[PDB]
Structure 1
Amino acid sequence: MMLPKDFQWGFATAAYQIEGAIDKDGRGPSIWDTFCAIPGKIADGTSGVTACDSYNRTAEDIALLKSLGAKSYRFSISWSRIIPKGGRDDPVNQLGIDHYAQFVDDLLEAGITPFITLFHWDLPEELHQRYGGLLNRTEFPLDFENYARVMFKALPKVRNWITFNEPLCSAIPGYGSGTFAPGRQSTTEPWIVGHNLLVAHGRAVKVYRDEFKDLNDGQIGIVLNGDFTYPWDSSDPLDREAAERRLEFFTAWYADPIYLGDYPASMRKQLGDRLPEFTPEEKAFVLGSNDFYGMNHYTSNYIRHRTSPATADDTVGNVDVLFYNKEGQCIGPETESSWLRPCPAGFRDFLVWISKRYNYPKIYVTENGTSLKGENDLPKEKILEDDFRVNYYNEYIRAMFTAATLDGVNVKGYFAWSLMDNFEWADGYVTRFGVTYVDYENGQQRFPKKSAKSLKPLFDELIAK
C-alpha cells in the first residue's frame, strides 16, 4: 500500500561512461582507453575521451540531480585517477582523490547521499600489462583490496559502497565473446576471471567490515545484473529447467558463492575443471560477503532447451535466448538495444526469485532503464518526448512496488539508469539510456527528457512521509 519513508531513489552513472577528461590530472589509461583504440570494437568508432565531460561539470550534474528530486546518486570511481598504475605499491595520485572527495562534499551539501562503485570495468591498463590484469588469481585481488581501502579511507563520509558492477560483463564479454575490454576470446578464461572478481570482492568486503564500516555504520556489496526467464514451451519440462539454469548461469554464478558458499551445481556439471575451486582461504573471503544485494535488471526472455550437449564456447548454459515463446507471444517491443525488450513482470519475478533463493536479503536496484529505438536519429523535440521511457519506468517501478509491498521483497532503493545519455560501451553514443538528452555535437548540453521530470511525482505517490 505504501513504501516506507527510508526507501531511496536516484540515478546512476559510470565514470568512464560520463566523465571524459581521460588524461586530465594524471589519470592513467584504463583497459577501455586501450580497447576503444581497436578499430571495429565500438559500433560508432568513438571512445570516452569526452563523453559528457562530467569530470569538469560537477556543479551542473548536482544541480540536475537536485532539480529532479534525486536525493541519492550512484556513480563510480575511476581507479586510474586514484592510482594511475593501479597496483598496491604504485604512487597514489592525490588530485583524483581530492576530486572525488570534493564531489562527495558537493553532493552531501545538496542533500544527496552518494552510492559509490569501486570497479566499473575500467581497470588500469598497467595492471593488465604487468601480470595479466583480471586473469591473475593472486595479484589482482590484492591490488583491488588495497584500492578499495584507499577509497574507504579517502571518503569517510560515505556509507554506501559497491565493489564490482556486473562482474559477468567483465568475464564473458571481456574474455569469452571479446566484445568488451580487454577483448579476449577464450572457452576457459571467463570462468577464471569471474572467480578472480569474486575473491577480489570478498577481500575488500573483509577489509571494509573490519576497519571502516563501524565508523559510520555503512554497508558494502556487489552488483549483479540479471534478466528473467520464462519457458519457451511452458508444456515442456525441459524448458522450465532451461529457464532456471539460464538464471543460474547468469546470476547464481556469483550469488551462490556469496550466499551459499559454492558455484551452482548446473555450472559445475557443464564447465567441469574450467570452473575454479574455491580454496579454504578464498571461500572464507567470498562466503557471506554481501551486506546488501546490488541488483541490475532490464528485461526478460523466453528460454528454449537444447538437445545437443553444450559446446566449449557456451556461456549461457546451453539454451536458446528468444523473444517469442513457442506460441508466438512476444516479450515486448524493440528498443535500441537488441537484447532489451520491456517486461515489467520479469522485474518483480526476478526480485522474488532472488529473495527465495538467498533468504530475502536487502536489495538495492542499482540499474534499471531502457534505450529507445531510433532515438539517436530523432529531432531534439521528439527526443525529449520519450513516452516509451516514461512508460518503461512507470510499469517497472510499480512492479517493484508490488514485490516490496505484497511479496515482502526486502528492497530498499532504486536507481534509474541513466541520469543522462552516455557512452554505451560497444554500442557507442548511438544507444541512449538517459532520462536526460545529451547533445554531443553542441558542447554536451543537457536537456531533461519527459522521463526525468516523471520520477519525482511517481515516487511521491509510492513512498510515505
Structure 2
Amino acid sequence: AAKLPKSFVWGYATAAYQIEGSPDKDGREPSIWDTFCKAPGKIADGSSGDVATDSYNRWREDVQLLKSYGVKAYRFSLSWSRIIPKGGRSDPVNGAGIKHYRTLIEELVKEGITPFVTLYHWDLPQALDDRYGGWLNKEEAIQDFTNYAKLCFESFGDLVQNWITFNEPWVISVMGYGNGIFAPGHVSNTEPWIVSHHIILAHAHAVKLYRDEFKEKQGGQIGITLDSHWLIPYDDTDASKEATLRAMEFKLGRFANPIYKGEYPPRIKKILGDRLPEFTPEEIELVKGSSDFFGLNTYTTHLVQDGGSDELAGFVKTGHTRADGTQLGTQSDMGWLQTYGPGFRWLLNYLWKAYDKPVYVTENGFPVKGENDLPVEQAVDDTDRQAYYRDYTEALLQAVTEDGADVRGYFGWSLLDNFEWAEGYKVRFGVTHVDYETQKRTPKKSAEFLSRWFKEHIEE
C-alpha cells in the first residue's frame, strides 16, 4: 500500500476552554467565553466550561492517553487569561499559568510527542473586552496580541517548533460578532469585518515578530488555521458556479488571499464597500506571505446555490441535499455536517494549488448522531465515526501520495468528548468517551482505527 513520508505527523487536537475546567484556578481570570456561558439562552443545554473534562487538573493522564494512542503530535491551545489574566501588555503576568503549560509541554517532549500550539482559540481575556472591546480596537488588540505571542515564544519556544496564531478567524468574526451565536455575542453588519481585519493584522504582527526574533534560534514555523468546507455548485448554471466562488471568498478567500497572496479578493470588496476596511501599503506588505504553513480545519462538503439572503454567508444558500433529493452522506449529530470523503481530497488539492504552502489539517472529525444518549458500552462502538475516519484518511493518502498535494499533518478532532461551545455537551466529537460524572476516559473503537491506520500508512 501507499504510505505518507516518515516526516508526516498525526495526532489529536483540543482547545483550552473546551477541556480544561478550573476556570479560576492558579490565577486564571475570566475569558469572554466564561462570561458568555453565564448568559441565559446562549448555550443549548445551559452548560459551561467550568469543569468540562477537567483536563487542567488531569493534564498528565491526557498526555499518557495520547502516548498510549501512539500519536506523533498533539495540538492544543493556550488560555490567554491563564498567562496574562487581564490580557494586556501592561497587566501582571501569571507565572503559575505559564508553568502549567511549560510542564505540560515538557511532558509531551519526554513522551516524544510534538506539540502544536494554538495561541488563540477564542478565549479572549474578558478584561480586554471591557477595556477596549477586544478585537474591535485595532491598535490596542494588535499590541496586546503581539505582546502575548512574544511572551509565549519566550516561555515555550525552546521546546515548541510549531505555532498557530489563530484558530478559525471566520468563526471568531461571524459567530462572535456577526450573528452573536458565539462569544462575545455581538450582532452587526460591520463588526465582523472589522474584527477579521484586525485579526489578520494581529496575526501578521505576531508572525513578523516570530520570524525576526525567534525563528532562527528556535527553528520553528508559524501559521494560521482557517476553516473551510469543500464547496460544490448546486447545478451547472452560471449562477451556481458564481455563487460557489462567492461563497468561497466569504468563507476562506477573505482571509487566505490577504495572508498568502497580498490583498482582499474582488467580490467581497465590491459587496461590503466601506464596511470592509482597507489595508495601508505597509500593512499589505506585512500581511502578504505571513503564514509558513496552511493550517486547515475541515469537516464536510456543501452544495451551493445563488439567492441567499444572509450577507455573512455571501448571499448564498448551502446544504447537503441535491436537486434530486439525494443526501451527500451519513448524518452526524449536527445537520450541517455529513460524511463526504471525496470533498476532503478535492479541498486538499485546491488549497495546495491556490496558496502554495504545506497543508496541516489541524482539525477533522465527526460527531455520531445521538451519541450523547448512549451508555459507554454502546458509545465505544462508534461505527459512523470509524467510517468517517476511514473515508477521510483514505482521501488524505490519495491526495498526497497519488495526487501530489503537499499535506504534512493530520489532527483528529477531538481527543475527548468535550464542551462544544453553543451546543454544550450534547455533541460528542471524541475518539475517547468521557463520563462527565466520573471523568473516566474510555477509548472508542475509532481511536484504535486511527492508531492502526497511521502506524500502517506512515513510512517506518
2:320: which partner in 1?
323
Structure 1 residues 213-252: aligned runs within 5 Å: 213-233=215-235, 235-252=236-253
How many pairs does the alignment contain? Answer: 458
Distance 1:38 1:333 in 2: 34
2:118 match: secondary structure: strand
| Corresponding letter in the other structure for 1:59 | R
1:303 match: secondary structure: strand
2:400: which partner in 1?
404
- Out of 377, 383, 386, the position equivalent to 2:382 is 386
Identity among equivalent pairs (%):
55
2:366: which partner in 1?
370
- What is the CA distance between 1:75 and its match in structure 2? 0.3
1:446: which partner in 2?
441
Distance 2:270 2:402 in 1: 37
Encode CA deviations 1:195-229: one digit per residue, 9 max, x unaligned: 01100000000000011111131000000000011
1:110: which partner in 2?
111
Tell whether the 8 Å contact from 1:10 to 1:416 is kept in structure 2 after alignment.
yes
- What is the CA distance between 1:138 and its match in structure 2? 1.2
Distance 1:298 1:351 in 2: 12
- What is the CA distance between 1:329 and its match in structure 2? 2.3
Q: Please say if 1:314 is aligned against 2:311.
A: yes
Distance 1:83 1:338 in 2: 38
TM-score by length of 1: 0.97
2:232 match: secondary structure: strand
| Corresponding letter in the other structure for 1:294 | G
- What is the CA distance between 1:426 and its match in structure 2? 0.2
- What is the CA distance between 1:99 and its match in structure 2? 0.6
Distance 2:343 2:249 in 1: 15
1:163: which partner in 2?
165
Which segment is superposed worse, 143-152 or 236-245?
A: 236-245
- Out of 439, 446, 463, the position equivalent to 2:458 is 463
- What is the CA distance between 1:118 and its match in structure 2? 0.2
- What is the CA distance between 1:266 and its match in structure 2? 1.1
Tell whether the 8 Å contact from 1:231 to 1:325 is kept in structure 2 after alignment.
no
Tell whether the 8 Å contact from 1:71 to 1:111 is kept in structure 2 after alignment.
yes
Moved over 4 A (4+): none
| Corresponding letter in the other structure for 2:315 | N
Distance 1:140 1:281 in 2: 18
| Corresponding letter in the other structure for 1:364 | Y
1:25: which partner in 2?
26
1:431 match: secondary structure: coil
- Out of 342, 345, 354, the position equivalent to 1:345 is 342
Distance 2:242 2:348 in 1: 19
1:301: which partner in 2?
302
Distance 2:349 2:251 in 1: 16
- Out of 351, 355, 359, the position equivalent to 1:354 is 351
Encode CA deviations 1:397-431: one digit per residue, 9 max, x unaligned: 11011111122111101000000001000000000
Distance 2:451 2:178 in 1: 40
- Out of 173, 191, 194, the position equivalent to 1:192 is 194
Distance 1:328 1:337 in 2: 19
Encode CA deviations 1:249-291: one digit per residue, 9 max, x unaligned: 1011110001111111111111111111111232222111100
- What is the CA distance between 1:164 and its match in structure 2? 0.2
- Out of 422, 425, 445, the position equivalent to 2:421 is 425
Tell whether the 8 Å contact from 1:148 to 1:204 is kept in structure 2 after alignment.
yes
Distance 2:76 2:401 in 1: 28
Runs of at least 5 residues in structure 1 that lack an aligned partner in the other structure: none
Structure 1 residues 29-40: aligned runs within 5 Å: 29-40=30-41
RMSD over equivalenced CA pairs, Å: 1.0
- What is the CA distance between 1:327 and its match in structure 2? 2.1
1:270: which partner in 2?
271
1:214 match: secondary structure: helix
Tell whether the 8 Å contact from 1:418 to 1:434 is kept in structure 2 after alignment.
yes
Distance 1:140 1:338 in 2: 35
2:150: which partner in 1?
149
2:42 match: secondary structure: coil
1:22 match: secondary structure: coil
Runs of at least 5 residues in structure 2 that lack an aligned partner in the other structure: none
Distance 1:397 1:141 in 2: 37
TM-score by length of 2: 0.98
